[PDB]
Symmetry: D2
Subunit: 115 residues, 4 copies
Amino acid sequence: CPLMVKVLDAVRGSPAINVAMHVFRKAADDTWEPFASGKTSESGELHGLTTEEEFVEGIYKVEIDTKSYWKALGISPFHEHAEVVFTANDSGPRRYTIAALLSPYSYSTTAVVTN
Amino acid sequence: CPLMVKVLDAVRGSPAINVAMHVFRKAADDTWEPFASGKTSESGELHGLTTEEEFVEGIYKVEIDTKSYWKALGISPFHEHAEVVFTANDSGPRRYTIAALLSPYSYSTTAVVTN
Amino acid sequence: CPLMVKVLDAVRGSPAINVAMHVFRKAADDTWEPFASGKTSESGELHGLTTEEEFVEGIYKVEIDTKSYWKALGISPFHEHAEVVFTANDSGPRRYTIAALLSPYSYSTTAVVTN
Amino acid sequence: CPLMVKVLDAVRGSPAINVAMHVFRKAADDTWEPFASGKTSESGELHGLTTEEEFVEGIYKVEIDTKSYWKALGISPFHEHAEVVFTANDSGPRRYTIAALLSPYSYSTTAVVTN
Ligand SMILES: O=C1c2ccccc2C(=O)c2c(O)c(O)cc(O)c21
């Protein structure tokens, strides 16, 4: 599991459950090609997006559908989605955890890169 | 100033100066059209991006070029840029301040929306 | 204004108005002596807490009463308050802006230090 | 394990390892009584601070020694420590995770409260 995404809800102090997200890889034409997708579990985590062999160096975008999450809770959010755009690099550590902390008008995202 | 962006550097405890950013607006064909661009001042603020007349309702993307900022400082960061995507002026004209707080492996973005 | 505090509300996307805060300075006996206090304005800012002459070197604690803020709004938050503790003016006089971004279960605080 | 603390480093994009912290419980005299302490592991987590029977309702303070963490890395931080002050409440979910995201001039803290 080279890539895992964890989403937290700062209003309720909980994992953000059933949050959909799509991962894209930047192609040579500079368009975003679909790569992987899924929805967070009861723990707010999405595991199994990709494999080591598949996740090669390149630029990736994780598009988290935060608007649908907030609307399902009856809250009107600011952002259309949360976007995390980054280069995967073999010179560094092996495993990427992308964390996203969600509020209606704010979000933060953090990368924890380990071996 | 219907749209203003302020950027802070969490490593130095300072405004983030000379941060470039590009604003796009979603066209009717669902492509991102260039809207405005600029760089932050010594206060870390970018004013004057647009006018009330030109900033119509739509979906806007503010791409803050954080990697270029960190690389100019000799730091290799995680993200390519920060991408703030939002619907603007759907209730009528509003004033938007987008704040961004930058660290090499993490950032947060917040919107202050006033009438 | 050697010390200023700005507070934002990540749920409403607005300045956090009427947030009370109490500033303390560590005395020679290692107890927290009351230093200054105030509340944020409609802009979410608190100015005029102290003067250059009175804000000497020391360890300061800014206690932002976030629970009182959220409870006045009918939200039960996690934290009692946010506590920002720092050494000030150890290199000579500086200007400090303490920013705080509030959600019910999360907050961040950042310092901008200028000479 | 009713209480767990996780600390992340936003400069290196890593768990913050060997971060010391002390937990205090507010006594009836309104003084902070030592409760538990430890240091984060290689995963940035501190487990086993307390037990269900011991962690009764009341106000607790987690004081994370962030200054020593940054100084050990050769970086001059703003804050003396990070402070998380909160009420433990039996009316809510059973397990508390306190997360802290550290930068030299900024930190965020989040509570994830689950069953
Ligand atoms: O709460 C957070 C959290 C809060 C604000 C920013 C980042 C994180 C974060 O990265 C994070 C993790 O990586 C994690 O593994 C468990 C967490 O609870 C968090």
